[PDB]
RNA sequence: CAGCUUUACAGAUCAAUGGCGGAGGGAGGUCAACAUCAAGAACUGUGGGCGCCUAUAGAACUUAUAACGAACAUGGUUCUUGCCUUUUACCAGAACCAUCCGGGUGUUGUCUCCAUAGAAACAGGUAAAGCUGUAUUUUUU
């Protein structure tokens, strides 16, 4: 078994391809690695990018993103 | 204690429909309830919010989504209230 | 056997502070003491039969009991020929 | 006047408790409710007449349906 | 404190029901008391897989379906 | 400590309305009378559907090592025995039954000793009694 805690602490050592989905969201999707891990779900993810969904690839950098609104991560 | 959540929890086991935020309503066994209504059922029908039917073995649901769950006339008479 | 009225015994020789069981779910059989198959083995027609005697008592009293010994005066035994081999010879 | 401090009073009356109005029904000498200590004070008083023995088991084989 | 219980559905394929219309199929590999899936990702509503290994928040969930019995 | 609800206050307008009203004692008594207490574990009423079935209110007392009594007599009839031999009187067992000494409640009434008010709330305040109260994922940030 494995709890959001401990794959996120995976995924906070590896650093590997992240793809975050937003919460009250569809448009948009982002591209990054985590970096950051806070005790709420905010996590800050550095190699960000902004990616618009196929119904490119858009600026973005390094993001503290109110982890709030999260739906996907997949590192 | 949360006294409709209580009546929630007694009422498992008998055949109740339940609709959520989305608007797409549900009915069979309830399975499963917790302080947050963390429901689940078995045999339950899933009406969409259309009225698009799909029958299905079982389902788990969040409380947050929950609208209002259609209980049976038999939680009317015992024994929660007194 | 000896077991009877040992609940009933125990409390009046306790003067009631000896709330005693018995039980018997082990199946833990033993041998009666004493060897079957012997012409006098025992004293007593009242009394308690000895303790090398009471084997003998119970098979035949048994066997009275079962109908299967033929009057007062019987005896268990081999059922073959050859004398018994003349009595294990 | 110490151990036996409440009863003594009144042990030795021809009506026990005539007044009394809280212990007894009254003076028709129906009913009875005494508190604690003197009920304490007649179980030791009683001691020689008292029953004397709690292990109900005792009477074995000595009931009346064994009689 | 409840922790939802979800060892019934553990190590299971599951249909989840997510904000605007959106499923997730996955087997389960862990949870949390916000019911925050832990899961193996697959194919996201033809069809098509994003990622490999997923962790889908509680506040997101709609719902979640017994695909295997 | 705050909110609400209840009571004793002071005066209130006293509408609003309630409710305690076409408001009416208590404690006892070696005091009565009445009912009634061994029965499918057992009682009674009420409706309804045809003496009964079916839902409804109720039910003091006495009990499950079974009994109103944590107690204990007596009398009768038979049947059995004993002492005997003739009966009473008796022995002590049985089965039946009765009598008696008492008991419980409930209701009436009387007898006694104490009594002895025909109106208080609302707006609050004072003080006291009954509950609740002290955002960062599922309730409300
Ligand atoms: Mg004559």
Same mark, same amino acid.
């Given at each position: 078994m494995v709890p959001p805690i401990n794959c996120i602490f995976n995924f906070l050592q590896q650093q590997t391809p992240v793809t975050i989905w937003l919460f009250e969201q569809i448009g948009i999707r982002i591209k990054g690695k985590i970096v950051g891990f806070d005790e709420f779900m905010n996590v800050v993810i550095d190699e960000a990018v902004e990616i618009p969904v196929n119904s490119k690839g858009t600026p973005l950098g390094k993001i503290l993103l109110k982890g709030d609104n999260i739906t996907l991560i997949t590192s | 204690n949360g006294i409709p959540v209580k009546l929630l929890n007694e009422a498992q086991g008998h055949i109740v429909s339940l609709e959520l935020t989305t608007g797409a309503t549900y009915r069979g066994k309830l399975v499963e309830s917790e302080d947050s209504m963390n429901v689940q059922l078995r045999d339950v029908i899933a009406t969409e919010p259309q009225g698009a039917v799909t029958h299905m073995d079982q389902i788990f649901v969040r409380?947050?989504?929950?609208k209002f769950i259609v209980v049976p006339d038999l939680l009317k008479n015992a024994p929660l209230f007194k | 056997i000896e077991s009877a009225g040992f609940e009933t015994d125990l409390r009046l020789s306790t003067n009631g502070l000896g709330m005693c069981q018995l039980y018997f779910w082990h199946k833990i059989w033993r041998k009666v003491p004493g060897d079957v198959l012997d012409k006098d083995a025992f004293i007593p027609k009242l009394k308690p039969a000895p303790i090398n005697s009471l084997s003998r008592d119970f098979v035949m009293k048994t066997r009275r009991r079962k109908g299967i010994?033929? =009057? =007062?005066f019987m005896s268990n035994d081999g059922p073959t020929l050859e004398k018994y081999i003349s009595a294990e010879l | 006047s110490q151990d036996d401090e409440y009863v003594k009073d009144w042990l030795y009356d021809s009506r026990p408790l005539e007044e009394d109005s809280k212990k007894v029904n009254?003076?028709?000498?129906k009913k009875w409710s005494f508190d604690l200590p003197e009920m304490s004070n007649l179980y030791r008083l009683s001691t020689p007449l008292r029953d004397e023995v709690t292990d109900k088991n005792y009477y074995y084989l000595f009931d009346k349906k064994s009689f | 404190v409840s922790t939802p219980e979800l060892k019934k559905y553990m190590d299971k394929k599951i249909l989840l029901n997510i904000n605007g219309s959106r499923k997730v199929a996955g087997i389960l590999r862990g949870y949390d008391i916000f019911l925050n899936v832990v899961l193996d990702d697959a194919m996201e509503i033809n069809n098509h897989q994003l990622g490999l290994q997923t962790v889908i928040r509680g506040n997101s969930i709609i719902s979640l379906e017994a695909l295997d019995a």
């Open positions: - | 409380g947050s989504q929950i | 010994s033929t =009057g =007062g | 009254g003076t028709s000498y | -």
